[PDB]
Amino acid sequence: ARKALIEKAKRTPKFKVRAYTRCVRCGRARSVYRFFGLCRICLRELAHKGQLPGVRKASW
Amino acid sequence: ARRRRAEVRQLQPDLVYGDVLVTAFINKIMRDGKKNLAARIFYDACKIIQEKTGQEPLKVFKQAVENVKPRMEVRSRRVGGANYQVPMEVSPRRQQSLALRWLVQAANQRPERRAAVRIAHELMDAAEGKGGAVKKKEDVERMAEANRAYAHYRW
Amino acid sequence: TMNITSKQMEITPAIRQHVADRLAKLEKWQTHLINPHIILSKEPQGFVADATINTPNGVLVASGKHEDMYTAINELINKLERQLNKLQHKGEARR
Amino acid sequence: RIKLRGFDHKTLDASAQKIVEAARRSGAQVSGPIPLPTRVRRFTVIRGPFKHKDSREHFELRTHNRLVDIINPNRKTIEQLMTLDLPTGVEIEIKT
Amino acid sequence: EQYYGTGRRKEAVARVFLRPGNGKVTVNGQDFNEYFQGLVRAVAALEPLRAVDALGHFDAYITVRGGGKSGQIDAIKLGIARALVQYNPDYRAKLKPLGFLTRDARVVERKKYGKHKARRAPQYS
Amino acid sequence: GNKIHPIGFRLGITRDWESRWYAGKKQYRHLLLEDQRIRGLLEKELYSAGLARVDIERAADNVAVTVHVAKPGVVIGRGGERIRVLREELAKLTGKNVALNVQEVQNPNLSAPLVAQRVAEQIERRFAVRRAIKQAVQRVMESGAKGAKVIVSGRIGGAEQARTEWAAQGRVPLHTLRANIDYGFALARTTYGVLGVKAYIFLGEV
Amino acid sequence: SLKKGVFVDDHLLEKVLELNAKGEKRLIKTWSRRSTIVPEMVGHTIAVYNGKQHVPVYITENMVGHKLGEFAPTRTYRGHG
Amino acid sequence: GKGDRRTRRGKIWRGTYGKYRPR
RNA sequence: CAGGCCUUGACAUGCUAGGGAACCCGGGUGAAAGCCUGGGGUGCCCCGCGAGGGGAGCCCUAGCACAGGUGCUGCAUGGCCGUCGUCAGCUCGUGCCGUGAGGUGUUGGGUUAAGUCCCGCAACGAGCGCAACCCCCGCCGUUAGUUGCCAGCGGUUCGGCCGGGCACUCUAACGGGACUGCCCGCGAAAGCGGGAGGAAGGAGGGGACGACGUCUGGUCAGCAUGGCCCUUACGGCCUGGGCGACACACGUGCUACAAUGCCCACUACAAAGCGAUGCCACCCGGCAACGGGGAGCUAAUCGCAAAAAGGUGGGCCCAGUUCGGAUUGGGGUCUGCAACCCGACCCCAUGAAGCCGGAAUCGCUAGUAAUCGCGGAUCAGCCAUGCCGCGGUGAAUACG
Ligand SMILES: [Mg+2]
Ligand SMILES: [Mg+2]
Ligand SMILES: [Mg+2]
Ligand SMILES: [Mg+2]
Ligand SMILES: [Mg+2]
Ligand SMILES: [Mg+2]
Ligand SMILES: [Mg+2]
Ligand SMILES: [Mg+2]
Ligand SMILES: [Mg+2]
Ligand SMILES: [Mg+2]
Ligand SMILES: [Mg+2]
Ligand SMILES: [Mg+2]
Ligand SMILES: [Mg+2]
Ligand SMILES: [Mg+2]
Ligand SMILES: [Mg+2]
Ligand SMILES: [Mg+2]
Ligand SMILES: [Mg+2]
Ligand SMILES: [Mg+2]
Ligand SMILES: [Mg+2]
Ligand SMILES: [Mg+2]
Ligand SMILES: [Mg+2]
Ligand SMILES: [Mg+2]
Ligand SMILES: [Mg+2]
Ligand SMILES: [Mg+2]
Ligand SMILES: [Mg+2]
Ligand SMILES: [Mg+2]
Ligand SMILES: [Mg+2]
Ligand SMILES: [Mg+2]
Ligand SMILES: [Mg+2]
Ligand SMILES: [Mg+2]
Ligand SMILES: [Mg+2]
Ligand SMILES: [Mg+2]
Ligand SMILES: [Mg+2]
Ligand SMILES: [Mg+2]
Ligand SMILES: [Mg+2]
Ligand SMILES: [Mg+2]
Ligand SMILES: [Mg+2]
Ligand SMILES: [Mg+2]
Ligand SMILES: [Zn+2]
């Protein structure tokens, strides 16, 4: 049970409870961000790459 | 303190008697940062220090502190196969710190229900030479003395 | 008390009490063995036995490694014994 | 009032001076760029792909707002501002 | 008519008006005594006035916002201190070495990840 | 197993973003998810071009989609034909106004992504890896830089035991906030497995 | 818990108000542990799923507000030692 | 106290309102 | 895990033998999945007045070629991370020394947070690390004002509310300021002590950053990837169970054993954030959770909001208690298709252990520990006492 999984989260099934964020890049269910569409890993890779608009290493 | 000497902070004098020794004391009464609390106790006690035994609560306080500060104490070194309790004089720094500490500590073991009373009474007795604190002093001091002959292993 | 972790392996009540029995050797020194923990583990070369134990005079840590699991465990105790005799006798150089 | 949004504050404040000081000539009385408190979105993320929960780097997202007021509009300030030098992203607002 | 200084300690700002008079003081629309009742640190940030031997010389209108009562006091401290030194700036001498101006920069430290309270670390084996 | 990404570490300082725009909550995800489809479409198709970096812009239904490159030819083409076949397919997914763009890169051997994917394809090509690495640095320093560093890791020359190969000339001070360090990464899938390549180019102080 | 509505699946609901109508039988197999025991069920044998088995429960007016699952428990315990 | 639902301080910790810490 | 189902597949590209396409709705059945099934009818390049027609959007069936596999190996791997360790280190070039491994430099004296810097020196340089360049805080300047203001007057329905103003406070962008630069003292120098001015001095405090390498460290279950393995099954859909089981053992934490405390009622002072099928003012029903209505806000202009400890004054009177709130009985609310297993909250009743903890053991040097509340991610709800942040009050001690 893996790639079939990412497909199963696409078309929205019987009840709306069954809604769960997966992520676009990796099929990761765990630690997906709503704002990015991303997991915490994928998020990191992209941010560091400079591909996330106005996203910067924080530091205060 | 490997490196240099460790600064001794000075302290804001208090807004009643204008004397550093009181705040240190109030600091030692304090618990979980609640300083306002730590204040009223000392002062309330000061009400009581005048109320009963009409006098100068400042005087009483500052007296029972000198009646507590230990002149000589043991600090134990390992030499060979035994740990010797060793006689050494306490710095004025350490005496203050040991003064205030035992005072409070012995205060809070009194049977009086209200904290400031406990503080009131313990101080009144220490002024006179009676109490848990004073004991601890005399005690520490007889434990020095009797070790007089370990005064050579002294740093 | 004593805990044993068989990591990525199917262990048994019998061999568990065997390791409890081999560790008993350190009871010889008559010194408190505090929450001892052994970990048994496979490996392509051979087994691995680790243990980490604290005692009033310090802590013991060591790894046994070997083809036979039992000789790995023995090796582990052999290494532990040494460490324990050292914590026990070290400052006796008290001259 | 014309509200300015967007992430890079250097890009933005360039085009808060453009728009405001544009309509200074072509209009009046141009109430200067007023910085709004910036809305920060923090993301704290676990550095590694695996366990290691005590190692993390913080990532934030800085979205800052500016309001600019032009006192008397002077229509054709509604033309000289009906285009302008952008830059590549920023949010323009206009209302009365 | 007036004398100004700006006090701050720890996310708190005091605006102090040194306007001359009886010595009545108002903080956020009520006398010192009503706004700080209880707290003994309240006796006070008025200490800067007793510093230059004027006690009653001035009244004070004071707004204060940010932080909490004590923080607010220490702000009033560099307030009545900054205001009074402005009034007759032969006033730095005996206010300054008495450590009255010079706002303390001591603030809360960021909580750091992996620690609990920004220094207190969690327990281990 | 320690080092911070030298691009991510300078975002806003030496270096700047390759997708530049503004959004806000309701549509960010989507905007963004577009870019990364665009990026995939491009990086696949535009592979043997060269390049390094794709800057991207947005206003409304307007994608500027800039592409810097090694040899612009495989984009523009004969008379500028294929530039348009792409300007199409982008738009087909973009569902909005695409602008396909080509900027040429100056000394493709001064660019990090570009130098690293060359040594990369050279490794898939079965070359002495240690020598491939000295060279790829040699080329950079010859065409100028203030220093250069290059890293391969994996079954280098096919060795059972993994190994990691390292070479550098001149400065590469990754602790300095104004480095201008161009860093780029490629990947060599060989008959035996994957090897990572990292290049570092020190262009100079800002 | 569960404020206004009375929850029975309207799958075994149907089944019970039919069997009661004509000549009432037994052996209704269900996997719904979520179903309340509704007074129309009172007396029957329903076969309820705990997940490896369909466990039969005689219904009695002793138990109504409950759920059909409560009487076919999911864990086989027996003890320790 | 902080664990006792029936008290003010109880509800505060628990982050709720009721008879004992009303709105 | 148990049972019920699917095969060219839930999914990619491509080729074909039938039919068709697209699409929306029931049915019969079943727990559902699935199986079995009654409908309407395809624009289009189009011989067309016609039957009809060709194509290909797109569906199916049959057939493959294949897909798919969170199956194995982190000692075959990339990538990213933990760690020694913010420790002061690790090396290269040429030269010199040794048959050689290798030495030298890098050691030595002195000083620093530091291979920091000074002075020596068969060495002379160079690089990766230190520092600095970046962010936050502390002081001042500018630019700027639908946030702030009787500071100023006027009005003032008394709400900075209107007028009016940017002085304030602030907000958020750009600057300045700290340099051992100045005095004394010592030194050969680097630099140490002491002083002045300064909001701040000796790295002003906190952050981001973490060398060559180590642990055959960690992850094939985020992703990727070599190789091995399964192909009506190690693939795929579903209903249900499980991941919450409980003789036991450890680790992290919550709340406590009370009077420096507990309870009630009135009354203060933050910061950072977050809000459109969201944040809900306010009105009403309800003891309440909540439920009705219902205004504002794409939000410095509305809302979450109450901050809490504190302040006041009243009760409790040393009691396993007006300490502590576990456990259980019963009655309700809300989310959700559904709260048996298994949600959170509210109310009534129940008020367990616990009187400060063995061997052993953890954290913290100052706005720190302790203590007090607040926000956020993830999220229908929530088992958060967790985590990441934020301010409030605010200690003790460092001989060595
Ligand atoms: Mg959910
Ligand atoms: Mg704090
Ligand atoms: Mg921090
Ligand atoms: Mg933790
Ligand atoms: Mg740990
Ligand atoms: Mg109670
Ligand atoms: Mg408490
Ligand atoms: Mg039916
Ligand atoms: Mg490994
Ligand atoms: Mg690895
Ligand atoms: Mg492993
Ligand atoms: Mg030779
Ligand atoms: Mg050599
Ligand atoms: Mg060395
Ligand atoms: Mg250091
Ligand atoms: Mg150096
Ligand atoms: Mg204005
Ligand atoms: Mg101004
Ligand atoms: Mg650094
Ligand atoms: Mg291993
Ligand atoms: Mg994988
Ligand atoms: Mg092969
Ligand atoms: Mg299932
Ligand atoms: Mg679990
Ligand atoms: Mg226990
Ligand atoms: Mg806990
Ligand atoms: Mg508003
Ligand atoms: Mg009892
Ligand atoms: Mg009780
Ligand atoms: Mg309960
Ligand atoms: Mg019940
Ligand atoms: Mg008992
Ligand atoms: Mg008692
Ligand atoms: Mg204790
Ligand atoms: Mg306690
Ligand atoms: Mg420290
Ligand atoms: Mg939530
Ligand atoms: Mg919380
Ligand atoms: Zn992802």
Side-chain angles (χ1 to χ4, degrees), chain E residues 25-30 33 35-40 42 44-45 47-48 51 54 56 58-60:
Chain E
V25 179
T26 284
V27 188
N28 261 28
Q30 62 237 78
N33 294 338
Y35 189 68
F36 327 105
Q37 156 174 23
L39 31 141
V40 202
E47 199 64 356
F58 327 101
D59 270 41

Side-chain angles (χ1 to χ4, degrees), chain H:
Chain H
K2 288 191 189 165
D4 179 15
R5 307 205 158 81
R6 317 282 187 92
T7 62
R8 241 254 288 181
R9 194 121 303 274
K11 255 124 179 62
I12 302 179
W13 190 101
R14 214 113 224 155
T16 48
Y17 305 82
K19 193 157 63 176
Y20 302 110
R21 181 223 189 198
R23 310 181 154 275

Side-chain angles (χ1 to χ4, degrees), chain D residues 16-17 22-23 27-28 30-52 54-66:
Chain D
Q17 233 273 309
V30 299
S31 244
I34 73 188
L36 275 200
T38 301
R39 292 283 261 239
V40 164
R41 177 154 270 140
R42 306 257 170 92
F43 317 86
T44 285
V45 64
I46 286 67
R47 286 227 173 193
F50 209 32
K51 91 296 228 279
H52 303 339
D54 297 328
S55 204
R56 290 174 203 207
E57 70 184 312
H58 303 288
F59 273 133
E60 49 193 37
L61 171 52
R62 295 285 207 86
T63 123
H64 354 227
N65 325 295
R66 310 275 170 108

Side-chain angles (χ1 to χ4, degrees), chain F residues 66-70 72-73 77 79-81 91 95 99 101-103 108-113 116-117 120 124-137:
Chain F
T66 273
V67 179
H68 316 48
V69 96
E81 178 201 15
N101 254 264
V102 169
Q103 213 218 260
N109 290 74
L110 272 224
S111 159
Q117 53 209 242
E124 330 198 66
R125 253 177 188 92
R126 298 192 147 289
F127 278 17
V129 179
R130 185 109 238 289
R131 165 226 306 275
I133 293 173
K134 278 177 175 109
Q135 184 162 332
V137 157

Side-chain angles (χ1 to χ4, degrees), chain B residues 23-43 115, chain E residues 38-40 70, chain H residues 2 9:
Chain B
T23 52
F25 196 83
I26 291 164
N27 281 160
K28 271 304 188 172
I29 310 176
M30 203 194 340
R31 235 97 103 135
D32 312 339
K34 305 169 106 188
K35 206 203 193 85
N36 210 32
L37 197 40
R40 328 147 121 291
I41 315 190
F42 181 76
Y43 299 128
Chain E
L39 31 141
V40 202
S70 191
Chain H
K2 288 191 189 165
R9 194 121 303 274

Side-chain angles (χ1 to χ4, degrees), chain G residues 1 4-9 11 17:
Chain G
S1 303
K4 56 265 198 278
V6 167
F7 183 86
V8 50
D9 271 314
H11 92 67
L17 279 201

Side-chain angles (χ1 to χ4, degrees), chain F residues 1-4 9 25 153-154 160-162 171-178 183 185 187 191-194 196 198:
Chain F
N2 20 19
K3 279 152 296 263
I4 195 70
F9 178 43
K25 311 179 273 217
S153 57
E160 155 83 17
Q161 190 69 306
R171 317 211 324 188
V172 195
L174 325 103
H175 281 261
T176 302
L177 254 323
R178 33 160 184 102
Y183 153 103
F185 171 89
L187 198 96
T191 67
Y192 53 86
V194 178
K198 309 189 193 202

